[PDB]
C-alpha cells in the first residue's frame, strides 16, 4: 500500500497568517479532516467530474521531474519552479511568491485546536493573503464523513499533494516530482519517506475546486496501477497514458431523482469489468 | 446570385420567438438508434440500440432486450457531449410534424452555423431519411452489423446485460429520439438538438409515444469518441428530471449548456477501486444522496 497526504494553503484565524494545513490522507481508503480537528471515518474515494476534467487538462501540459536529485522541500521547490519557468508555465516574476508559499509552515491536525482553525485563502502579488472571490462550497466530504495510521507498511513511500490558490496566475499549473531516493520532508510529520510530490497551483477559475483537484490527484496516486506506472515512468507521456487508462476504467454516475440500492446494484458487472480492464494492462494482480 | 453571404450571429430578434406558454410536465421515453447495415441487402438503415423508460435496456445481437440497469456513463462520453453541446445547433420550438421537415430544417441550420459543408448536406439528408427499423424486424433482417456513412467489437452494455414497455410508460409521456451515426466525410462531430413546438407522431420513426425531442449526433471516427456511448450520454441526460424540465423551458443553447453543466456538477465518478463491487457501489448511496439534496428541491 501507500500513504498520501493532501495539504491546502489556508489562513489561520488568530494571526491571519497563511500556511499549509493537511486536509485529507489516504491509505487506500480516504480519511478527511473536520473543522473540529479530528479525522472522519475512512471511506472509498469518490471524485467529481469537474475535478477529473481539470486534472487531465493540467496533467496534459504538466511539469514532470522524474528521478530528481533532491532531499529537501526547499530544493524540490527550487527545481520545480525552475522547470516551471523553463516551460513558461509561470512568469519568472512569480518565482519569489511561489517559493515563499511553498516553504511556509506545514501544520497538521495536532495544532488545529491550538490555533483558531483554518480558512480558505488566495495568494496575492504582495506578501499578504487575501479572501477568495468565487462562491464557496463547504466540502461534501466534510459534511458527510467528518461531522460526528498503523496500517501504513514500514517500507512504503509517502506522497505529498499541495493545492493552493494564487490569483497572479494565468492558468492552473501542475508539477509532478518523483525523487530518485525517498526522503523525509518537514511537511509530513509521519515517519514515512516521501517519494512523489504533487504541486497544484493556480488562480480562481470556474469549475475548478482545488480541494477536489487535490483529492483527484491523491486518489490517482492511491490507485495501485497508476502508482506502479509512476514508479517506472521515465516520461510525462507514460503518466498521461496511465491517467488515460484510469479515466477509461472510471464509472461516472449521473444524477437521478430515484436513488435506489437495487438500481445501483445492477452496476456490479460494470464495476467488475472496469476493474478487470484496469488491471489487465498492469503487471500487478487485483487483490 | 453572385453573393455568398457570411452568417451573422445576431440575437436582436431572438426574444421575438420566445413563447409565453408554460410547458407541461411530461415524463420522457428515450430511444437510441444507430446507423447500421443489414447483411441481407447491404442497405443502410437505422436500428434500435437502447431505450430508457425507468432504466436503460440495450438490444443484443439476438433481438432480445437485455436486463434493465442504471445508466452508467463513461468519462469520455460526458467530455465529448459537453464539447459538442458548446458548439451545438439547436432548433427550439420547431414547427414541424414530419421527419423530413425536421431533417431539412436541421441541415439548413447546420449549414448556417458552419457545422457542415454544403456538399455534405445531400448525403446527411439521405442518411437521416433512411428506414427507421425496430427490434422486431431485426430477426427478419438476417442480423445487423454497424456501419459508417460514406459519401458516394461489441458494446460494453451488450456484453454485460444482453448475452443472457407500453404498460410501463406513463400516459402523458413524450419521446426523445437520439440518432447516432458515423460519417467519415465530416470534419468534426456535430450535435443537433431539436425541440418540436408540439409533440408529433412521425411516420418515418414510429414510437410508443409522440416525439418531442430529437438528438442528432454525427461525425467521423475520432480519438476518445464512441458515438454509441455519446448517444447513451445524451439519452441519460434527457432521462434526468432537471435537465428535461430545463430543455422544455429552454429558449437558447446557453440555457441548455447551463443545465448540462449543472448535471455535470451533480455527477459522481467512481474510480477503479479494488474493493468488492457491492460495497464500492453501495458507498455511492450516501454521497449521491447528499449531492442531490438541492438539485430536486
UniProtKB/Swiss-Prot annotation, chain B:
Phosphotyrosine found at: 17
UniProt subcellular location: Cell membrane; Basolateral cell membrane
Residue numbers on the Cytoplasmic membrane side: 1-297
Dimerization arm: region residues: 253-297
Signal peptide coordinates: none
Quaternary organization: A dimer in solution, but in its membrane environment, it exists primarily as a mixture of dimers and tetramers and spans the membrane asymmetrically. Component of the ankyrin-1 complex in the erythrocyte, composed of ANK1, RHCE, RHAG, SLC4A1, EPB42, GYPA, GYPB and AQP1. Interacts with STOM; this interaction positively regulates SLC4A1 activity. Interacts with GYPA; a GYPA monomer is bound at each end of the SLC4A1 dimer forming a heterotetramer. Three SLC4A1 dimers (Band 3-I, Band 3-II and Band 3-III) participates in the ankyrin-1 complex. (Microbial infection) Interacts (via N-terminus) with P.falciparum (isolate K1) aldolase FBPA; the interaction inhibits FBPA catalytic activity.
Family in the record: Belongs to the anion exchanger (TC 2.A.31) family.
Protein name per its UniProtKB record: Band 3 anion transport protein
Primary gene name: SLC4A1
